[PDB]
Design a protein around this ligand. Structure first.
Ligand SMILES: [Mg+2]
Ligand SMILES: [Mg+2]
Ligand code: NA
Ligand code: NA
Length: 310
DNA sequence: CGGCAGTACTG
DNA sequence: CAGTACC
DNA sequence: GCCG
């Protein structure tokens, strides 16, 4: 990354737009930052800046300004509210609209939120684990969490397949949470397990709080036994076997890789979601028994998970 | 001008 | 429904 | 914000 003198400054703008709710401008900044972080050379021309995909006129100029003067004028005019909005929206279950409302109501600290804000069930859990949920775990801990869920699932039914995806499957040393995907080859026996499986995981004291408990996806909080353990975010998603390849691909990510893959599909008159690869104009679901089939039907060479870490 | 993803979940 | 979250 |  020969341009972190640029990307540091842009990252500040990106987050300011994100926490103020301008998600599209925030997306554009994010794309340009990612492009800047994988070019070979240091940029050093407005015509060089225009060179790279994801960088246009307005952002070329900003590189041209940090070009010469060494900083970016726009940074000095970011609203004083941004760090507080960032603080509030790092509560799980609070996004930009809730953060801006709390700010308008005069709240400025998590002590204000704790003492005086009306919190949803999810946000109260978010607040209780504010520090824990900002911490990444070693991938070795992610393995223990997966094997905990797997053990509990394979007790009620031997055939259940359980795979940790996200950054874990992409090979990262750190993980922000553990994303566990469960299916069954019989195509049948995957339904209705949650009641049994979550009650089991509660039997241990392993599951500590539930954030979402739907028919198909569970999001909550777990903690392994012993001293020195932190609470960790856990997602468990159950899918029919026919959709396993697309779900594996979606939940393995990364999010920018999936975004790149949806765009490529659209250029071919298809669509790609966590459930299926389809034709589109809805369209026809194409058969994808393996991740390799998704790439092949998109005319792409297969990429192992570790090379999807975009 | 307008897409840049679709869906599951909560209340 | 709006808002938030999953990658 | 970018790009078609
Ligand atoms: Mg994850
Ligand atoms: Mg997750
Ligand atoms: Na460009
Ligand atoms: Na949040």
């Amino acid at each position: 990354n020969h341009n972190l003198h640029i990307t540091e400054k842009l990252e500040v703008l990106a987050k300011a737009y994100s926490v103020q709710g301008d998600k599209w401008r925030a997306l554009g900044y994010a794309k340009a930052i990612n492009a800047l972080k994988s070019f070979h050379k240091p940029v050093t021309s407005y015509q060089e800046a225009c060179s790279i995909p994801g960088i246009g006129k307005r952002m070329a100029e900003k590189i041209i300004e940090i070009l010469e003067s060494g900083h970016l004028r726009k940074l000095d005019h970011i609203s004083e509210s941004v760090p507080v909005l960032e603080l509030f929206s790092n509560i799980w279950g609070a996004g930009t609209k809730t953060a801006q409302m709390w700010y308008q109501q005069g709240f400025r600290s998590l002590e204000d939120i704790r003492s005086q804000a009306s919190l949803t069930t999810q946000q109260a859990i978010g607040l209780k684990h504010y520090s824990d949920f900002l911490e990444r775990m070693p991938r070795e801990e992610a393995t223990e969490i997966e094997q905990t869920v797997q053990k509990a699932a394979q007790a009620f039914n031997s055939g259940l397949l359980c795979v940790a995806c996200g950054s874990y499957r992409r090979g990262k040393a750190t993980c922000g949470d553990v994303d566990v995907l469960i299916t069954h080859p019989d195509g049948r026996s995957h339904r209705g397990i949650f009641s049994r499986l979550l009650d089991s995981l509660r039997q241990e004291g392993f599951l500590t709080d539930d954030l979402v408990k739907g028919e198909t996806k569970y999001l909550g909080v777990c903690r392994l036994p012993g001293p020195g353990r932190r609470h960790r975010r856990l997602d468990i998603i159950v899918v029919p076997y026919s959709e396993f390849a697309c779900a594996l691909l979606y939940f393995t990510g990364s999010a920018h890789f999936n975004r790149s893959m949806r765009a490529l599909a659209k250029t071919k008159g298809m669509s790609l979601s966590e459930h299926a690869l389809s034709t589109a104009v809805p369209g026809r679901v194409l058969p994808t028994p393996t991740e390799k089939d998704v790439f092949r039907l998109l005319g792409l060479p297969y990429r192992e998970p570790a090379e999807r870490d975009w």
